[PDB]
Design a protein around this nucleic acid. Sequence first.
RNA 1: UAGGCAAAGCCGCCCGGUGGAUGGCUCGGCUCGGGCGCCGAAGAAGGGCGUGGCAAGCUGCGAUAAGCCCGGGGUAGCCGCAGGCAGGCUUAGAACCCGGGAUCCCCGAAUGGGGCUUCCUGCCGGGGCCGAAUAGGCCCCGGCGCCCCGUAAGGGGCGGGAACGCGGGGAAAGGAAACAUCUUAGUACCCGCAGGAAGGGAAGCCAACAGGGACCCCCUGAGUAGGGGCGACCGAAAGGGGGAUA
RNA 2: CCGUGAGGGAAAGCUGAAAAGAACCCCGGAAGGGGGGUGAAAAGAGCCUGAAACCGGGCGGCUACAGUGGGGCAGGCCCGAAAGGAUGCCCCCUCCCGAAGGAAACCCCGGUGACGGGGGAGUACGAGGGAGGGGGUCCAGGGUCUGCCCUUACGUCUAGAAACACGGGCCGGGGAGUUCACGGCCGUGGCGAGCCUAAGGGGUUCAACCCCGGAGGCGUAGGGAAACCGACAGCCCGCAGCGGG
RNA 3: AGACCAAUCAAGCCCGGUGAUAGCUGGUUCCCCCCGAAGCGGGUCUCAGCCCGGCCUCCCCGGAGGCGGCCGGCGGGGUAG
RNA 4: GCGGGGGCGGUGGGGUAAGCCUCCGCUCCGAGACGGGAACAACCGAGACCGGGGUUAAGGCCCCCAAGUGCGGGCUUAGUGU
RNA 5: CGUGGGGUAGGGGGGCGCGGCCGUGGGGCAGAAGCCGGGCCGUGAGGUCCGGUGGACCCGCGGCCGACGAAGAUCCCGGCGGUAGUAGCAGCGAAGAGGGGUGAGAAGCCCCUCCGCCGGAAAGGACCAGGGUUUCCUGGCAACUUCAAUAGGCCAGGAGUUAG
RNA 6: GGACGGGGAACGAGCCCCCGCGCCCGUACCGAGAACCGACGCAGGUGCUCCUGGGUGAGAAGCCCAAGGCGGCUCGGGUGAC
RNA 7: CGCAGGUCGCAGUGGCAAGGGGGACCUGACUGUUUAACAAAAACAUAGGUCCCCGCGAGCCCGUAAGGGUGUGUACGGGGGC
RNA 8: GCCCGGCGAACCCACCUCCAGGUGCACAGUCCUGGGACCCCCGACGGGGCGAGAAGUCCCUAUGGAGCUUCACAGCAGCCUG
RNA 9: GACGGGGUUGAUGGGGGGGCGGUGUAACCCCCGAGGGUUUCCCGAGGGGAGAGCCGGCCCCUCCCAAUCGCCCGAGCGUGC
Length: 183
Amino acid sequence: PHFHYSLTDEQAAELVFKKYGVRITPEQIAKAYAPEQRMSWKKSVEVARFIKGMTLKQAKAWLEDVVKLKRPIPIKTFKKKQAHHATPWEGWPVAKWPVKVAKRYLQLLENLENNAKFKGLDVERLVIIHAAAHKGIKIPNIMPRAFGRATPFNEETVNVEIVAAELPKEVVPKRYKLNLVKR
RNA sequence: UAGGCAAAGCCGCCCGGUGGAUGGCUCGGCUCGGGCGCCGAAGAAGGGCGUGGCAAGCUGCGAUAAGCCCGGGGUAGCCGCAGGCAGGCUUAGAACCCGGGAUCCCCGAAUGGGGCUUCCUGCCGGGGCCGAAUAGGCCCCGGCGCCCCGUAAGGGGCGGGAACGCGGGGAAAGGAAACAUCUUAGUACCCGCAGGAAGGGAAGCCAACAGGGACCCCCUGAGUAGGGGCGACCGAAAGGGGGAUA
RNA sequence: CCGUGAGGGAAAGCUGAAAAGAACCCCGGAAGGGGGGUGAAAAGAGCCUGAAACCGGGCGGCUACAGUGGGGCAGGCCCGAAAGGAUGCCCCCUCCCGAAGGAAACCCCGGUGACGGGGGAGUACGAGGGAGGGGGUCCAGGGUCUGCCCUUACGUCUAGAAACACGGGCCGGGGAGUUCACGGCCGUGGCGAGCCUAAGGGGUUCAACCCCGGAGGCGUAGGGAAACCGACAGCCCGCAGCGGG
RNA sequence: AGACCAAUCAAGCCCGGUGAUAGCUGGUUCCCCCCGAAGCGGGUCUCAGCCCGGCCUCCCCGGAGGCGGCCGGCGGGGUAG
RNA sequence: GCGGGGGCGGUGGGGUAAGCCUCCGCUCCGAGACGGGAACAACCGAGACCGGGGUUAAGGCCCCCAAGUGCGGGCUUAGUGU
RNA sequence: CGUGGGGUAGGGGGGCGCGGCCGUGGGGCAGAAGCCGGGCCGUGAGGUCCGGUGGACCCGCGGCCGACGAAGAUCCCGGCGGUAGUAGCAGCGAAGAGGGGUGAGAAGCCCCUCCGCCGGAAAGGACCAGGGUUUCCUGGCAACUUCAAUAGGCCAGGAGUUAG
RNA sequence: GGACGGGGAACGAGCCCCCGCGCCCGUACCGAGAACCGACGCAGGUGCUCCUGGGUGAGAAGCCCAAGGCGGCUCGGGUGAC
RNA sequence: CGCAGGUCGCAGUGGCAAGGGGGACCUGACUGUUUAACAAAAACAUAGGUCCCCGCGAGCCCGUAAGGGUGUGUACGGGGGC
RNA sequence: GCCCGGCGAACCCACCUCCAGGUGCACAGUCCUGGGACCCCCGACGGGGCGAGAAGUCCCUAUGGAGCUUCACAGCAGCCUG
RNA sequence: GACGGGGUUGAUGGGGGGGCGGUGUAACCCCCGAGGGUUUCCCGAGGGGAGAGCCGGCCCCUCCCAAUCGCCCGAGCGUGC
Ligand SMILES: [Mg+2]
Ligand SMILES: [Mg+2]
Ligand SMILES: [Mg+2]
Ligand SMILES: [Mg+2]
Ligand SMILES: [Mg+2]
Ligand SMILES: [Mg+2]
Ligand SMILES: [Mg+2]
Ligand SMILES: [Mg+2]
Ligand SMILES: [Mg+2]
Ligand SMILES: [Mg+2]
Ligand SMILES: [Mg+2]
Ligand SMILES: [Mg+2]
Ligand SMILES: [Mg+2]
Ligand SMILES: [Mg+2]
Ligand SMILES: [Mg+2]
Ligand SMILES: [Mg+2]
Ligand SMILES: [Mg+2]
Ligand SMILES: [Mg+2]
Ligand SMILES: [Mg+2]
Ligand SMILES: [Mg+2]
Ligand SMILES: [Mg+2]
Ligand SMILES: [Mg+2]
Ligand SMILES: [Mg+2]
Ligand SMILES: [Mg+2]
Ligand SMILES: [Mg+2]
Ligand SMILES: [Mg+2]
Ligand SMILES: [Mg+2]
Ligand SMILES: [Mg+2]
Ligand SMILES: [Mg+2]
Ligand SMILES: [Mg+2]
Ligand SMILES: [Mg+2]
Ligand SMILES: [Mg+2]
Ligand SMILES: [Mg+2]
Ligand SMILES: [Mg+2]
Ligand SMILES: [Mg+2]
Ligand SMILES: [Mg+2]
Ligand SMILES: [Mg+2]
Ligand SMILES: [Mg+2]
Ligand SMILES: [Mg+2]
Ligand SMILES: [Mg+2]
Ligand SMILES: [Mg+2]
Ligand SMILES: [Mg+2]
Ligand SMILES: [Mg+2]
Ligand SMILES: [Mg+2]
Ligand SMILES: [Mg+2]
Ligand SMILES: [Mg+2]
Ligand SMILES: [Mg+2]
Ligand SMILES: [Mg+2]
Ligand SMILES: [Mg+2]
Ligand SMILES: [Mg+2]
Ligand SMILES: [Mg+2]
Ligand SMILES: [Mg+2]
Ligand SMILES: [Mg+2]
Ligand SMILES: [Mg+2]
Ligand SMILES: [Mg+2]
Ligand SMILES: [Mg+2]
Ligand SMILES: [Mg+2]
Ligand SMILES: [Mg+2]
Ligand SMILES: [Mg+2]
Ligand SMILES: [Mg+2]
Ligand SMILES: [Mg+2]
Ligand SMILES: [Mg+2]
Ligand SMILES: [Mg+2]
Ligand SMILES: [Mg+2]
Ligand SMILES: [Mg+2]
């Protein structure tokens, strides 16, 4: 089945003008989709939020450091009973190192890099403008319990969509922006 | 002081994901009316197993195994559900439909005898094979159930079928605002036995001095007479009108 | 498929007119993704439409010194194309009429006084209803937030429910006075000292419809257990109505 | 030990009678308009039910009187004190 | 519908008493909105079709809170009391 | 005209909606039903229109009939939440490590070395019932294994049980 | 298997050599802390049912080690508060 | 299996393995059995004691019946109580 | 256990609740009058939420059961007798 | 999570040397040893001497190794009373 994006190319350009002050055409937009990935759905949402507004190289470098357990990911929404940690950013103490989710996002970023390159876009000026994860279909399974009862033990898959735009180099951020209160 | 100005969180709309509602559809169901109505030792119904080039299920079929023969209809396509890959069949008339035949494994009333495994095994007669042998052994085919009728030759019963029919055995729950007689009910259910229908049927009748005229079924008589802790409740018959008529 | 067994037993329909069932290029270990195609439409084989709950993203409003939901009034921000008004709405000014109600300054009389009374004055004003002029730009409606005022979840039995009385996590779909017989009564319709046919029969354009069928049922008379017997227009009061004054 | 007789025993399980019965408990689905109660008396194996009256409602007949108040005339009464 | 309940009155009758039991009567709640009583079915006021204007009822008028730090006399020293 | 306007149970009177039928009048591929949002009308049940989506049926009016209206029944069936990236994946006296290979990818698959546990046995040898292909070979990783996987009692294809 | 009897033939063995025949069904694998039953790849139950070397020791006890098997009673790492 | 001598340790059945003991009362004699899943007991049973029905075509018990159990038995026996 | 990586449920859930003293179907998160609180997150606990679990087994009621008893009302076998 | 110290302009952890401490005297060598035998050059539990040996989640000294390379946050402007 085909999966649609929450945002069409026409509104992606409109969003780019609203956030960067520049006008671009749908020819400067690259997309990729990773349907039904077997990974944590809550941590996928946190990753998509964090890498939005990064350049593609910035997101790749950070995620490659999550895999090595050298940089964490902030957990803003799914934080009940999650411990605090020292963080490289400012304004939020709840952090995780989702290795499995990071590896899948790196494959999606690899597909997105190719899709932009195939269009002739300059990858150094590619900026992630929209990222979203969705709970996909469930793969049902049961866990036998005590007293003759069985309870659900499900694999909830994740649909990840990503859209990036090629911006003029004079408006592209050159460093990480890591004030999470202001972000 | 308020704005630029933002945490986590809240509300609303749009888009997406999830979900499968709604709407439309319908080769399915249900109800009613009409027809038609038995199958089985000539081995049934039911079941098991097998059967397709690639085939698991369903459907069909039975080692001749989605099929064989003859005839009629039907003419050019065909190889079931089932839209694939091959290879074939068919104008010397197929597929398909209808009638008649052939084949029809094992179990099954199952019937030579067993059967704790739908498989095993005996005797007799005939045949084949191994074998030097005519011995011995092995294999194939046929007969071999019980109870009966008949002098015998021979013949009969058995099992099945959605409901309906005939004979017998035969409750309780509930109701009676408790409950026992009673009712429920000669019901549920059980046992036996038939047919395409069964049962009934040809006055030791009914009536009332006037007369009907075998029987069954329908309408009525009638919730009347009558039965009944005369309570709950139960409940005709003759007569009259019809279906049909022997 | 469940139970040793007697027995018990689900869920599950829909591509398109036509496969035209997605060539080809790039990426991926692969599921697959991007580009590019087919078609009227992706309707993409996880296949019509594709709601809500639910989750993600975007947008609008709020957000860390202020206790929550609902209603009214006033305001902030945002939407306000169509289907509503724009002959609108708002402000100012002027004019007219005006219900119930209705002052004040000031003069006079009283009281220690709060205040009362006569005049001013049924005036100024007053719900609303009419007419005109100047100025402005959207108004209505909607989302959200703030201020002020008001405000004790629902369903239920109960004398008494916000109850520390019980039931519901949410959403969708489903989910409860029916039919026959008999009786009483009502509202109408047909016929009327009569009313209706039942089963059934003939025809049909064949369960409809037309015609036949009066058996029987109820009514026309009651009293009595039964044998048995078996019925009014005479007088008064008087509503309606009619006639007289 | 009223143990155990297939997770079942002061009387198994399966299917049937069977939609057993329940004066008891739960539920009973759209809108507006008119009027508007009762928990009293009597009887009942009656006391968580039901029937006959009181109280509600709707329709019809009938046809001129009626009475939660007061005054007076004529009566009754045996309480407070 | 045949479970009633609150206020007041019959020293009702009973009971140590009871937000107690059992009668008699008016009213109210049940089935009655609203103002006052701090909250509060039945205490006080009062009965609501909808919108608006006005005036009163109970009760209140230092602030919370609309309206008086209202007027004369007297008492209390306990924050009694309100 | 009314010193008319509260109301539970209950009685009485009128209307709205849903599915079909008998009539009548219409709409629809120049877009029906359904669906999302919105304006207008009605006290209200509800009606109607607009924009979007959709792709073939539907509606007004009169009459008639019902398998006819849900917020609730520890209601039924399905779906899906918060809980929550939480509990558990400890306890029953074994456990791993280094190097190499394979592979897209290796703590975990294969080989060696080191370390450990059983040894009258939750563990080695045999084997009944029961199971029925789980056996063996080749290949594989969507699902399955409380984690991983290139492994496997899993999946696909092939094969295998010999008696005086 | 033997003995004790009865009947029959003229041949003929339990010894030696030599010839022939022996049907039908089962046979893989697990046999259990993952192949059985318990909804499960379940610390239970079935089956430890039958068998087991050396040292110590009374011992088929425990402990240690062979033959033989296992690291699959199918999560890993860090920290060293309560 | 014993004797003599030497000698070390906190500890010599050094780990492993492996009884705490005594006095008295109540109670059931004892071993045994029991509420599978809250009771293991003083409850049940028991050997022993005693009573009853019975000479067998009996006594007691099962079956609608045909018939059956005790009984392939016989008072030193079968059945039934305490 | 806690922290990291991986898998990934359930109970329960009208909505969801700072404290005091009142009031009320007499034991209030939601009403009244006060007192406080910058918001969010982690660990822990078990005082409260008349916490969750289970249509109270206690007790009563029903013209409800079951089983058991006998000197209940009846009935049927079995045995004895004509 | 936080907190505190150091971060080359440095003794922050390790290594090395030294101090202090725990245990109890390793190896090698020499002597004694109940007794027995290849007769007294061998066996032999054990005792003595010299040397301790092993070890430190403590202290000092010494740059030998590592405190590196790097990644971020951050006010700046208006308006009214
Ligand atoms: Mg179990
Ligand atoms: Mg997952
Ligand atoms: Mg935020
Ligand atoms: Mg057959
Ligand atoms: Mg046979
Ligand atoms: Mg027959
Ligand atoms: Mg019945
Ligand atoms: Mg009865
Ligand atoms: Mg009874
Ligand atoms: Mg006949
Ligand atoms: Mg006949
Ligand atoms: Mg009868
Ligand atoms: Mg679709
Ligand atoms: Mg507009
Ligand atoms: Mg307009
Ligand atoms: Mg109650
Ligand atoms: Mg009560
Ligand atoms: Mg309530
Ligand atoms: Mg209740
Ligand atoms: Mg609940
Ligand atoms: Mg007992
Ligand atoms: Mg029984
Ligand atoms: Mg019974
Ligand atoms: Mg039953
Ligand atoms: Mg009224
Ligand atoms: Mg009740
Ligand atoms: Mg008088
Ligand atoms: Mg007196
Ligand atoms: Mg009463
Ligand atoms: Mg009273
Ligand atoms: Mg009531
Ligand atoms: Mg008040
Ligand atoms: Mg004031
Ligand atoms: Mg009214
Ligand atoms: Mg109509
Ligand atoms: Mg309701
Ligand atoms: Mg549910
Ligand atoms: Mg959940
Ligand atoms: Mg844990
Ligand atoms: Mg061990
Ligand atoms: Mg392990
Ligand atoms: Mg060992
Ligand atoms: Mg041992
Ligand atoms: Mg073994
Ligand atoms: Mg294998
Ligand atoms: Mg293999
Ligand atoms: Mg397999
Ligand atoms: Mg074998
Ligand atoms: Mg296991
Ligand atoms: Mg070995
Ligand atoms: Mg762990
Ligand atoms: Mg020990
Ligand atoms: Mg004893
Ligand atoms: Mg027990
Ligand atoms: Mg015990
Ligand atoms: Mg005893
Ligand atoms: Mg004695
Ligand atoms: Mg005695
Ligand atoms: Mg974790
Ligand atoms: Mg109180
Ligand atoms: Mg509460
Ligand atoms: Mg906690
Ligand atoms: Mg109860
Ligand atoms: Mg109960
Ligand atoms: Mg009673």
